[PDB]
Amino acid sequence: LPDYLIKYIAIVSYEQRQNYKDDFNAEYDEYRALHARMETVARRFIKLDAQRKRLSPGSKEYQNVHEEVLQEYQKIKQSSPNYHEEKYRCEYLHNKLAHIKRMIGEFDQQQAESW
Amino acid sequence: SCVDEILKEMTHSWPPPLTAIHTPCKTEPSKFPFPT
């Protein structure tokens, strides 16, 4: 059970909304940087996958794609800090910030229902 | 074979990045089911 689900509960006041928003903003920069790296890393392999699917398996191009997948994966395996630690950090921040934003949005909806 | 496993691990679709918190909230967030 992630800690942010215990910490960030339903909002009861605008001051709480402000605090939640400030906490979101305090990690937003790291989140966006990591997310951008994750998308950039994924893009190369999604591209290689699509190429591999549309190519004849008897073509030199196919072998080239194979090799390029191996080389790029080697780049990822040797990266520092470890790719999997960055990925975990990015998933955690995504769902944490998504949860905080969910609390804020549900609060906004409630407030709009009463005025 | 090994390349197949590599691509299975690296081609998962990431959700778009969360936007900043507008006032009131402009975009509805959601928890994402990341693969495990």
Residue numbers in the entry:
A (entry chain B): 525 to 639
B (entry chain A): 14 to 49
Question: What's the paper's own text on this?
Answer:
The functions of HIV Tat and TAR in promoting elongation are completely dependent on their ability to hijack the host super elongation complex (SEC). The SEC consists of the Cyclin-dependent kinase CDK9 and Cyclin T (CycT1 or T2), together known as P-TEFb8; one of either of the intrinsically disordered (ID) scaffold proteins AFF1 or AFF4; one of either ENL or AF9; and one of either of the RNA polymerase elongation factors ELL1 or ELL2. AFF1/4 is >1,100 residues long and is the principal scaffold that holds the SEC together. In this study, we set out to visualize the last of the three known interfaces critical for AFF4 function, its binding site for ELL1/2.
Here we work with a fusion construct such that a stable obligate complex between ELL2 and AFF4 is formed. The crystal structure confirms that the AFF4-binding domain of ELL2 has an occludin fold, as predicted from the sequence homology. It shows that the IDR consisting of AFF4 residues 301–351 (hereafter referred to as AFF4ELLBow for ELL1/2 binding) folds up into a helix and elbow joint arrangement that makes extensive contacts with the occludin domain of ELL2 (hereafter ELL2Occ). AFF4ELLBow is ordered over residues 314–349 and buries 1,535 Å2 of solvent-accessible surface area. It begins with helix α1 (315–324), is followed by an extended hydrophobic sequence (325–327), a polyproline segment (328–330), an extended region that doubles back on itself in what we refer to as the ELLBow joint (331–343), and a second extended hydrophobic sequence (344–349). Hydrophobic side chains of AFF4ELLBow α1, including Val316, Ile319, Leu320 and Met323, are buried in a hydrophobic groove formed by the C-terminal half of ELL2Occ α1 and α2. AFF4ELLBow is centred on Trp327, which forms extensive hydrophobic interactions with the side chains of ELL2 residues His559, Met562, Cys614 and Glu615. In the AFF4ELLBow joint, the side chain of Leu331 sticks into a pocket comprising Tyr552, Tyr555, His618, Leu621 and Ala622 of the N-terminal half of ELL2Occ α1 and α3. Moving closer to the centre of the AFF4ELLBow, L331D and I334D reduce affinity by ∼20- and 8-fold, respectively. This highlights the role of hydrophobic residues in AFF4ELLBow helix α1 and immediately C terminal to it in the central cluster, as the critical anchor points and affinity determinants. We observed a cavity at the AFF4–ELL2 interface that appears likely to be present also in the AFF1–ELL2 complex relevant to proviral activation, on the basis of the complete identity of the AFF1 and AFF4 residues involved.
